[PDB]
Write a structure and sequence with these properties.
Chain B: This is Major tail sheath protein. The structure is cut from a larger assembly and holds twelve copies of chain A (about 140 residues) and one copy of chain B (about 50 residues). Chain A is mainly beta. Chain A is built from one helix and ten strands. Chain B contains two helices and no strands. The chains are: A mainly beta (about 140), B mainly alpha (about 50).
Chain lengths: ~140, ~50, ~140, ~140, ~140, ~140, ~140, ~140, ~140, ~140, ~140, ~140, ~140
């Protein structure tokens, strides 16, 4: 029945949000996160003695249809050429669609690649990718 | 003398290859567009060395 | 075969338990191991005479629908960035649904990579991969 | 949605223009970009503190049915071998079919790879890939 | 008609066997074998002057459903952790199901990896891999 | 209607031709061409200052059924062993089937690999590949 | 086309013969060759002036249903481990089924890799790959 | 697991200090020491009678990314030009950021050489070598 | 992220200058400097009592692509043959682009050694090594 | 395969010991030894008549991860600064784990040189080189 | 773009000449020069008072594929055996093939060493070093 | 093909012997020889008048995996400590295992240096160098 | 392409000869030659006035696979131990195969040093370095 009563998230009960702004009509997005974990090893033994965290790597990829008006390029939140020298950090948030409450937050995103595709019988599509400092969640 | 000697060699060897390529008259499919190409293939090799 | 009589384990009769909590609505899990086996060769013979073990590797993957509450973040058995550095050793067990019996256990789990999927027309899945010191079972 | 009202671009309302000539019967095109973003790390912290840009990469791919005349060779915007060395800087624009508006532009295009397909029971396609100095749009 | 009269092996007319024991209910198994052959080369020639055998490499992979009772782990014939230090060589044999006669033998197998998979609507499956000293067949 | 009136090439309106000879009953052929383009870079800037052509690489691949009579091997135009020491350059041309006029020419082809396949219920097929000095087209 | 009139070879009219024995119930075979062709480049020109051959490579693959008797092991044209070191040069021929004519031949074959498949609900296949000194045909 | 249990020091937790001030964006630090040990050799015996320590020598190198402000020359430590004559004795420390516990101290460092590295499409890096009088273990 | 707010210098922001004119297409600049430090040893004690700076030694190397015009030989900062004895002492500076602000300066460089390279299909490159009276930075 | 029956020692079975206490997290141990052999040459003949052993030279290097506590400096087997002159001669042994049985022994080691390393995101490591009176094995 | 616009010299356009004759299949050329600069050091100051040029030295190396005819020994330039005593002074030039414009000249070369390299399955290569009196910038 | 036809020696068939005993698990053997050839040079001619052999010198190195028993020190050959003074002259041979035919002999070896290598997650390896008086060709 | 018409020599066409007999399975041949050139310096001028050839120095190295019979020791071109002093001066020639035509010649080689190698599973290889009176080519 109502979308608020299920115990599990799905695409349509979630809203992509960005600094002071709802995005909307996003197709998909994936957040990759790694801790570069490494296993300490000893002589006299074949098993690793412990596992140590070494480096926080992570990326967010974003995938959207090209909007006819106020698109990513016109807004500049993913943009081109040596204007990148003056494109500050962006924060990106994933929010419950019915409540407008935060599910997670990404701090400190900035671009890594930005691509598009055109084809005769099809929508113009865009791929964006940012690298970020920390993922997070609170309440 | 040497300007003419190079010309004589160049013409003989052009004929030596045409004696295979089109003097065989192997089909009426030998368009003039392939004749133009083969000439340029010969010229390309003489230009390369 | 009848419910108790099935001579092969299935996803219907197995459930993953982590730190004394069942991981409900798990999509899948994969256990992966390598012994770094190497062969000893010689001049005077083509084949390896004997093989020896050098470095053990253990890994486990887990997929789980993103739960509105009691997801791995809320659980306190996974976290993001500088929160991971404050989280002690985790243990994971595979438990039989009908007999309440440990099927296998993993000792000293630590996270390797941990990944999302926010797709339209689909259910959200969390995708995680851990390293551990050893794999085990004791009936 | 109605013809003028569609809030998303499509292959039906977009056409590629190169040196003031429309590339009719284009099969597809892909824009591809990388910023060589790199993270700054330290002793005393796991995460990268900030990310910086180091080398920009731009690329565009184009697919087009091999035209009996006015193909890219005949056009004079592509050529083979030692003919390429006599061909000046090319510019490419993506133009709106309904509004006659520049959608994006590429500055200083040069060819990277350029490829054929002479298959039976099929239409011949030319497949090309260019590098450019920068990508741009100015509405 | 009868399985003994065909001139070709198939999966159901073959029985997997192991030291003093029939295995049964195996899904598949593959035996890889290489001779590291190398071609001697000369000046004054482009063809290889001869081919020489250099090293015998080989592996057997095994693939089975997880049995409810007396499984591989309980038997220990593929097993976990630093108990591997005390798991001796195993011999593995592929036998005619109707006659119990040997088709081939593998001498001297020991583990190389051991993996499992779990999924909601599915059987629990296991992958095992051994490296071995020699393949063989006799009568 | 008539094949001469369309503005686009297709497989059946094209004829593969070779020195003094039409080939015919070819399945497919692809011509790969690259200019090894490289981007000059500066300090004080992230964009490439220009793009420079560096090396002309290119290959043609050819794909044909094995003919019962006067095949490639019997003709020798793709051939085997240390007879390759005495197999001169070949020119290969792609020609309008209705007019016998040249669409493109490849200068200076010589072999790079030559392969075949056999299977019970199927045609014997052959793969050939040449490397060439220049592609070209004229009138 | 009628049986004798087919202008293209097929698996129905071709059979593999090795050391004077036909390899019946062959599933497939692939012939593979490389000439190590390399281009000569210069300062003062972008293209390679001429190409030269440097190292010849020959290879052939064969697939065959595992025969109850007269398989490649029983044949004495393949073997396992330290048995291979006692087996002399092998020759392979491809022979026409209708005309009893050599289609191609391979000189000085030696084994590279040799592989099994013991799958349920399927027929067992032997999979083998050889190197040879040269490939040939002499009508 | 947590940084409060792991048995081994890591660059993750270790901080670096100089003149009672922490260093930002320090990449790597090398620490060498020699005790000029010489063997006392004999007539009447081939072995050494004893080993004796003879001259102490050490070196510490520090690698750092060139900060936009407060670099080594801008901060007033090892610098360029005449000012080296007036750079007094300065101490360096290695610390655990978790507890601010000193790991080791390098008593009375002095500069040896200063390398600054600029490369296009790379971060600016530095590499200073220091000689020091004594080192000590505390806490 | 943006140029104004990053805390680390990069090859992307810096510009290299000489005699009040920028350098064209510099690929790198390295600056090595030594102080010849020595430790004051005594009899009666194993470690040095203090270190003393003995000599100033300066080296800088610049790697550059060979501009078609206005390279070092054409521009007069370097010269071939007899001519170096006529040339003056030259000043080289490092300067951030956005503010045209000196980062460091090599007061009065003079050439030591000069290295050039030409290769097939590939970019022509240069290298010059200088020595300098002093190196200093202010503002 | 199993530890009791393998014919070759590995880093997996050996344990390293010092002053009757095991070494924690040793990564390697190398032992180089020379006899300074010389050939007795004469006039009247080109080759040496016999060789003579001149001097004993011993070296051993140990590479270790920097334990949080009880490293070589904390444990007293090595020391920084003044302190090495107070320390005694130390014995190092190699010992198989399963029997606690000496393999070799370095009778009376003494330090030569000491090397340490810290790096971003990465494990802190040590190295010490010793010299020794004699090396011997018994039982 | 075209070779008439690109700002940087490339091996593509550059030709090489010797004794007023162009070199075929030249691969690479190195050009080194030293001005033996020595620092004039002082009592009463640590820095150098000035730098002085002191001895000129240069070297040019040329790499070339061994031609079937008119190689260095067959053409009469640097050669083998007694004839070196009678090989007079010879000049080398670097030229732009586009305009036949001289880039630089090496005045009065003389041979230093001749390397000829033969390797199986590789092209024959050569590497000659020359000393030269003076070099010059013209055009 | 078989080991009874191949024209080249291989480590596969070659055995190694010392003191009339075969070596187990020998990995590699190097064999160097010098005849100290000096050129006799002249006044009045640049070439050498002749070459003369002057001092013979050779070296053989043997690499071996550390056996659990009968290693070089446990077997009584080159060893550690005082016992080197009482290790007499010993000969080494290289043999063909196929026929037990001697390849070469190293007459009267004597030890030079003994390297033992231990690394975590690797097999223990060894590397002994020997000087020898003469070598000989037999059979 | 074909051997008769290529303009560059390769290892595929050349044959190496010694004492009027070909070399079997040569892997490489390198010939290094020096003229010891020196520049005539003066007071009053910085650059040399002319260069002078001082001495002839010749080196050639040949790498070969160890033939089962008729290697250098068995064939008498090289020898072990005492025997080199009995052997004559030897002539080595390079020769194109197709015409048996001398390319160069090393008049009167004599051995310097001899290097051999045996390894597990792998080909036995040789190397010999010679010195020679003169090197010359004619026809």
């Amino acid at each position: 029945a109502s979308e608020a009563k299920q115990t599990v998230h799905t695409g349509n009960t979630v809203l992509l949000m960005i600094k002071g702004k709802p995005v909307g009509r996003a197709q998909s997005a994936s957040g990759q996160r790694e801790y570069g974990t490494t296993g300490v090893y000893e002589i006299g033994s074949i098993m690793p003695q412990e596992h140590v965290y070494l480096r926080y790597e992570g990326t967010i990829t974003v995938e959207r249809l090209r909007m006819k008006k106020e698109n990513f390029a016109d807004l500049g939140y993913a943009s081109l050429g040596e204007e990148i020298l003056k494109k500050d950090i962006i924060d990106i948030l994933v929010v419950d669609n019915l409540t407008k409450q935060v599910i997670i937050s990404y701090h400190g995103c900035s671009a890594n690649n930005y691509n598009e595709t055109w084809q005769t019988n099809e929508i113009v599509t865009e791929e964006i990718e940012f690298s970020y400092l920390t993922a997070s969640d609170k309440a | 003398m040497a300007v003419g000697e190079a010309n004589d060699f160049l013409v003989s060897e052009l004929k030596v290859q045409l004696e295979d390529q089109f003097i065989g008259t192997r089909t009426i499919n030998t368009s003039a567009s392939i004749i133009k190409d083969f000439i340029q293939s010969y010229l390309g090799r003489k230009k390369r060395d």
